[model samples]
Target chain A: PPYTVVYFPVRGRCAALRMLLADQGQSWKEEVVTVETWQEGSLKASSLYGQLPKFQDGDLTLYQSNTILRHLGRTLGLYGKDQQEAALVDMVNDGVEDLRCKYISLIVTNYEAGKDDYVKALPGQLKPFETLLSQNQGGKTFIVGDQISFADYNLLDLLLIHEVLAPGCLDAFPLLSAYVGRLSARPKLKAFLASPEYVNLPINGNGKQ
Target chain B: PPYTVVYFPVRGRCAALRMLLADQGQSWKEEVVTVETWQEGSLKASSLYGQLPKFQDGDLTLYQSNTILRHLGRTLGLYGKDQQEAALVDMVNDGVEDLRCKYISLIVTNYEAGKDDYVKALPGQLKPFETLLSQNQGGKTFIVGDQISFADYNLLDLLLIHEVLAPGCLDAFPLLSAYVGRLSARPKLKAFLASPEYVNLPINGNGKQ
Candidate 1:
């Protein structure tokens, strides 16, 4: 049986998983829950952890976005083969999630005051990725070795989400900006971004908004 | 050469590593950096990441608290023996980190007049752990199977930090309160908590006398 991915239609929290599945060329049914449907009974019965972006593979079910990403990355060979590289990828993935949380806070609370915090902290936060990309360039186009890994996809998702939420968001960090542009231009990623499945969702603010 | 763990002297962030190291029976030098030291020079020289709880094993240096925890757990054979168990431990570990962050926000922000936000949320946040303990309580005392994994240590550190910050904070959740007491009774943990090295610092908003 094919895997069943269940999440709210909104991309607020579930976009990362959708992007991962798309990047892997895996065909899974996207079950977008509606408010009424969720209220009727879906939400409680679904997630063991009582959260979205839950995945069901045959009889097994799993929640937790990072866990799902790690599982998929390991299974699809999107994470690096070695333990060290996989750990690095996981760090980057979690780092992006951390930054995304900050970004959402800024958007949700109104960008005027929050913008200062976000912009002031941007350089320091993006610096790690800049250094990682520069150091690990290794004459390869991807972030991890010669092949594209989940780190690459996760970073790309973050950048795209950033751009969608705050246009010209990448102006300050040239290296990271270029890296995002380069990654986004990838045929698979570009195709996924343009696909109908990715349209008409709130990209910014909390899931409530 | 001994491993070096560097962080602010406060148990706020660095205690997880301290507890993990102690649990593994590892000998490591604790290099506590003062705020003045951080402002003067240390922060800039902290590898490419520029963060705390940096670990130095011989010549190799690494950052990211969770990443460091994973590495130490792997090295000490405290991370689960298998992939599935390892992932579950990671999930629980990350969950502990998540709750820790919330706990910090509550104390640091003085609960921000949204007393309901945290006070009401704490029990629900801790309910899962209660369920985990109850489910896995087949004559076993620890979080994971019979053996004490890093997850147990992480949870204990979280409980200890919270207990220090709020005194009777865990009183509401009897199961978790008892769990914390049970774990705290461990010789190594008890010794560390009682050690001069573990002396309490002025925790921010630790209640005005």
Candidate 2:
């Protein structure tokens, strides 16, 4: 395999890229870093940025989940058609990342106490994405262009997990709700989503969500 | 001017890209969005992501500071010489962003309360970047490669502002301290940094550091 993902046992940050590889029909190795392994400090010390989800493609090593996604998108020709479109893809992905960061904070740092406020603000946080979808090809095609970019994979994972976090959260956003369903129906991705490797693994590391 | 930056009067998120343009000797228009203007609903509604730092390059419009940076990087050939180096640039910039987010939260959300803890953890957070600089070209060149990439500008801005937050924070990390000094000496950037527009603006909207 040309790709390797070094991450925790949980799906956490690696879920989007895993879905990307599966949908792209690319095989990769997962070097799961257990909590016990991480506590030993060697792997964390070795990592350039002292983080997980360190990705490798053949000889190239990378950290930062969005960086890996952009790398794959660039290599796999999923970034966008041209510079302008690529910028749009980046904008969409950055928006996804901003919301994703908030989600991670809620889940990891302050789940029980902050869940109510987070849920209350969820609609506002999510509406931007819905507006993005609406503006692009009447929300029928992919997020940026006609073809799916890596951001689509990330956004798909975000939407699915949000659905789990707040059932019927997408009820107000018709496009995002349908976008998740449409993307999830792809055969390979559908299979990957249903697999125990994905299903059995907790969405987060702390066992809160 | 070919480039226009629509952002708050403060340097906040737009500082790095502004620094990049100045260093690169490119001219751009600053459409400063005063808080009074932003308080009105129209611009916010019109914005796709409903955020600040809306940018325009000739006919194309973009949001997300990083997306704009990348677009400029791609157009100006500042990303890297090749794809692998591009990925490395992304990795560095994302790390910069992660720390920037924490800094912003501390300043904007919980400044007085979180200030001490943030400064305490600042060294650990700053170490990864110092390690990154050390790994590449003996800390002599840029963050990612021999040539300066977009991440260099972003990282440089991050380092400079941290100095404002906690003076001498970089004393423990000699590489980063020198990196900041070296990048700041670029003739065009030096002039820009000294100019009233750059010097007068608050680093944050709330009048916090």
Can you write out model 1's per-residue Cα lDDT over B1-209, one digit (the tens) per residue?
26898877667666777777775677789887777787787575655556576777676567767777776776677766565666567667867877877787676675656445665666667667766677667424777566667787778777766666456777876777888878777788778777777767544324421
CA lDDT scores, all candidates in order: 0.70, 0.91
lDDT per residue as tens, model 2, B1-209: 38999999999999999999998999999998888889988999888778989998999989999998898898888998988999999998999999999999999899999999999999999998899889988899889889988999999999989999999999999899899999899899999999998999999999998
List the candidate 1 regions with Cα displacement exceeding 4 Å: A35-50, A171-174, A185-187, A205-209, B41-50, B111-117, B137-141, B165-175, B200-209
Angstrom error of the Cα, residue A205, model 2: value is 1.9
The superposed Cα distance between candidate 1 and the true structure at residue A159, in angstroms, equals 1.2
Worst 10 residues of 2 chain A by lDDT: A200-209
**lDDT by residue for model 1 (A66-125), tens:** 777666676678877675666577667767777877776777776776676676667677
CAPRI-style class, candidate 1: acceptable
